Design a protein around this ligand. Structure first.
Ligand SMILES: CS(=O)(=O)Cc1nc2ccccc2[nH]1
Length: 165
């Protein structure tokens, strides 16, 4: 199962790890992708997860968008986890670099409550432009299910743990 995670709360855990390497090792029931509304997995966590699936995630995602149209900012969809997990929960946090409403971050984390346990990144952090300290706070105050957070950046991981209230 999950190993080397620091316990932050009753249900939130955190580790300095590459979420792709964590997914390949654990093969969790659910891996969360930091998706955009189009499911275009170009960079950040999305690009890295998609590359690990040999682009199968993108092919499946393009079929999903062709059928359903785009997701909402704050929304999600469940697709296959391919070689990484049973399922991938594609969650759209607001991208502050694209001017999206940061209040939608709580709505984005509410999607995690539909799954008992998830391997996840901090939503809207990294290339999405939001403050990761704020994202962790919203995560702990919103998610009630078991979430194992993988933070790629060591320096950010140390800052998140040391500043956690
Ligand atoms: C696995 S990779 O694509 O070679 C490198 C990588 N790993 C990441 C984890 C989180 C965000 C971006 C990331 N880029």
């Amino acid at each position: 199962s999950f190993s080397g995670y620091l316990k932050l709360t009753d249900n939130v855990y955190i580790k300095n790890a590459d979420i792709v390497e964590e997914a390949k090792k654990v093969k969790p029931t659910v891996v969360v992708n930091a998706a955009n509304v189009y499911l275009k997995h170009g960079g950040g966590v999305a690009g890295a997860l998609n590359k690990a699936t040999n682009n199968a995630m993108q092919v499946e995602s393009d079929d999903y968008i062709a059928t359903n149209g785009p997701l909402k900012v704050g929304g999600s969809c469940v697709l296959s986890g391919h070689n990484l997990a049973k399922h991938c929960l594609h969650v759209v946090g607001p991208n502050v670099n694209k001017g999206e409403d940061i209040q939608l971050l709580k709505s984005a984390y509410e999607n995690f409550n539909q799954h008992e346990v998830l391997l996840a990144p901090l939503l809207s952090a990294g290339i999405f432009g939001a403050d990761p300290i704020h994202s962790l706070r919203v995560c702990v105050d919103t998610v009630r299910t078991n979430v194992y957070l993988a933070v790629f950046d060591k320096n950010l991981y140390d800052k998140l743990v040391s500043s956690f209230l």
